[PDB]
Subunit: 368 residues, 3 copies
Amino acid sequence: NNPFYLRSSNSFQTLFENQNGRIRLLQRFNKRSPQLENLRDYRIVQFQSKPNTILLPHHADADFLLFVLSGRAILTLVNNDDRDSYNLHPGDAQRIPAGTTYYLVNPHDHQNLKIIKLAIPVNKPGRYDDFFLSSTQAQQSYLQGFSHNILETSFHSEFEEINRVLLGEQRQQEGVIVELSKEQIRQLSRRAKSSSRKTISSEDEPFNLRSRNPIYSNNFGKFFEITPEKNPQLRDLDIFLSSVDINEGALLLPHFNSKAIVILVINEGDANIELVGIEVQRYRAELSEDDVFVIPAAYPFVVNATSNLNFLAFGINAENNQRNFLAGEKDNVVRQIERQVQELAFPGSAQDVERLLKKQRESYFVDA
Amino acid sequence: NNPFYLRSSNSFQTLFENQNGRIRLLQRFNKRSPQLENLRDYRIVQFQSKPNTILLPHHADADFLLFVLSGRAILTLVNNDDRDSYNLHPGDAQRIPAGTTYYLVNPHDHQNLKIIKLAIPVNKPGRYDDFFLSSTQAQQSYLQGFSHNILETSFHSEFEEINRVLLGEQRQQEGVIVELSKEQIRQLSRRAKSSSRKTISSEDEPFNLRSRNPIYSNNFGKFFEITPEKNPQLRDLDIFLSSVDINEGALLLPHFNSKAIVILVINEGDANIELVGIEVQRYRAELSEDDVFVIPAAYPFVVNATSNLNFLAFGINAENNQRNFLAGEKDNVVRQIERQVQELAFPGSAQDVERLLKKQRESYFVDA
Amino acid sequence: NNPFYLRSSNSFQTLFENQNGRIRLLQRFNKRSPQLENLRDYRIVQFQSKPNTILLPHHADADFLLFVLSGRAILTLVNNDDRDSYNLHPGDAQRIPAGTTYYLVNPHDHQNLKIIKLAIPVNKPGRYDDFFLSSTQAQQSYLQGFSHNILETSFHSEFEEINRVLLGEQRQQEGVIVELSKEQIRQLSRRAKSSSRKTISSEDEPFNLRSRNPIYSNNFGKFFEITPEKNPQLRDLDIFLSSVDINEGALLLPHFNSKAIVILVINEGDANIELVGIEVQRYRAELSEDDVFVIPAAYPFVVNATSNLNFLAFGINAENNQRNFLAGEKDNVVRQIERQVQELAFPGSAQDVERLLKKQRESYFVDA
């Protein structure tokens, strides 16, 4: 039983779901195993919506860091005196600060919109609520919290009028994800500023993870990553971003993280994973699509692509985190040790260990 | 039963009280409702003093942010090698860094001194202690912690000597708040550097919340605020101050704070308040003088002044916090959504909705 | 039963020990009393090794701040692409980023290597694990966590050849501290950069606490101290390091810390200690070598040196903390209070109190 493994059939809680989309919310990282207690302030949210759809405007008491896996979106954040629309593409990411009102459109005509966002609540540690402004068959708008009298006074209106317009106590929609006119979307999209190479380091607009050269890349996979060093949005959240692709039958050589807690999310494919932790203990698990395997800090682990494989990883506590490899040539730790220490470390000869390490000649991704 | 409402009668605990005033300590915010587990690191104190009294020198294991609600005071801070007296007036605010020995004088003849301070204990979370230097009838000087021999050694004297002067085991005051000589207050009161417009941004001297123009003001009320943006002393604790007048039968329009948890204390007047959380849930509560009400971030709330009303707000987690309103002209989100989305959100012609919003022609403070 | 006092003969727990030394791990600070809750994220590690010994390579999911109390060590950090050896002398401090893999060497022929290190665990709060690369009769190597297929696929070899070289399932050493050839230590000592007066403020190499002038130093004692202000490394951990010495029969004049929580580890000699908390409460404790006494912030406390003494102190919550002294000429707070308040503070004439406080002519360390 692998505590660092969250399947998908039956921890994701569906927050809303209709014929137009669904929003699921991963279970608390510490409700699973107290071993994950330093993640108690984090959640995973998965949003899927149909082509030509919107998410009705709303805010939450939590930062968000969202990542576009596939499809195309329009993320519009509304403020007290401004509005900002951003044209997200696959591999784009952006930060929705806490308390900001916003809506999500899927401007595509056939493709789906699969987004995953990392919630960081503000009031209750690892719990947060969703304030929908709109009054839908599926949710009351938070304006209906206020008394008639307050409402009449606040809006300068008889109740029958504010009710008949904003609330409606059928005239209202079915769900918080509704469908859009082509004509509508045609308007909504023509003022969305979009991700560019110039945004790698902007505290506002979205930056693309895969825009840059992958840190690691060879015939067996590619390792894209963005870190608080290069991105102010990720400096404040102090988290690192990385999305990495593995050719079926390759794998990511064993490695550990100096100081980062990593939340990987399986985007596509199948994969086997092996985590070790303390006389050592094997933490293996067989991950499929939409699964989540968390990898504590400084724990060595390996990723075996049992199919063509792409996943997203969130790196908690990522200021100056370093990746260390035990196999392969470049970034190998077990090959920087002084020889005499190598001798002393294992049962073998300085030259005998110098021989076994030099064997496997590739680095980062190697083939099964 | 509003877990965000702290009835002054049964939420305060007197700490030292007598003929010359009293000190009371608000209860832990988390012990009330676990919904407030992010304020567990904070406490509220009310210090009230009769005219021409002093608070005997002492210190705490908590950073203090004191706000003077009413009266005049001479705050003095004794360091290891320096002393710094300050002249506080109503509205003045200053920060007593933890473990700083300090005494409070009330130089007024007829007027009291009503202060309120936010406490951030350093040793236990939410719990702090007071180390009174004085040997009193209500408290032992903490020097009376040391054995006779260490004390003899430390001061270079006999014990009968050092007890007869500093401890006294009838010669010693009844409380930690004792009356003063005019001649004393004459002398104490002539070196206390006083607040001014050149102090809004000092690490050291206190700053006035109201020496600057409010951020909102109309005939029905005023909204004074200082943030970590303009203050170093606030930047550090990462808190905003705000002090707002609402005429009777006016109200603060329905709004929510993006990421700031607000601890508001009713200074003067009566008010009704309304909070919404999640199908929505009304959280009304009828505030009176000295009451406390807490408003989690991104929670919409409204404050209805049922008699001339002024209150004080401490905004916890206020780096880059935005106020959003839901009613009135200026700073209304609901009125910044793309219209076509307004069509989709409420059961009301985007035209029929543009009409309702525009109706209330005022902003921030409107009239019941 | 002083909760702030952790007796060494029964508050340590041994993690590894053999004929080549032993590693102890202090018990959890709050496990003892909830009163120390604010340290819960910290631990004390003690290490000591025979002459001519190496601590086999490992890493831990925790930052370490080690201090060389006594001996000469060669500290070698091994990165993915770099390697960094440091020649540590007594008084040298240096910081091991979590998940850094590193090995310790004791190059002396007769002397030891007594090192203590403060531990800040990443994943679980207050709990960490040592991941040892090395296949030893004591512990498995974490590469034995993985499974044969993955191990085979990783190194590009069969299993027998990888188990005969790195693991060995007789041929392997006995414990995680093994002895060295002189030839070995000789080669291995070739590039260990050593501390210097030009390291007092380097973010990398180790800095000596005593290489500067102390803050306090008369004929009865010395107070070496370094704050986050002067060291980038102590800044990131927000800590102060202070090595102080007290002659037999002198003491540290009673005093309290403004906002730092102090973890003092008794290094050499005996000492009587006394603490005061809250009606006051005496917390006296008779420390011996290797004991640990923790001092809540703004708790006044005196240290009596019953034999020739020296202790290391950790200053948690260090940024801008202030030592306030209750007796003595210099840094005495009680001698700063206005005279008229002094008159009002204690039962004694302003001149009768001015008199007692001028007696002790000396400052900080007096004689008993």
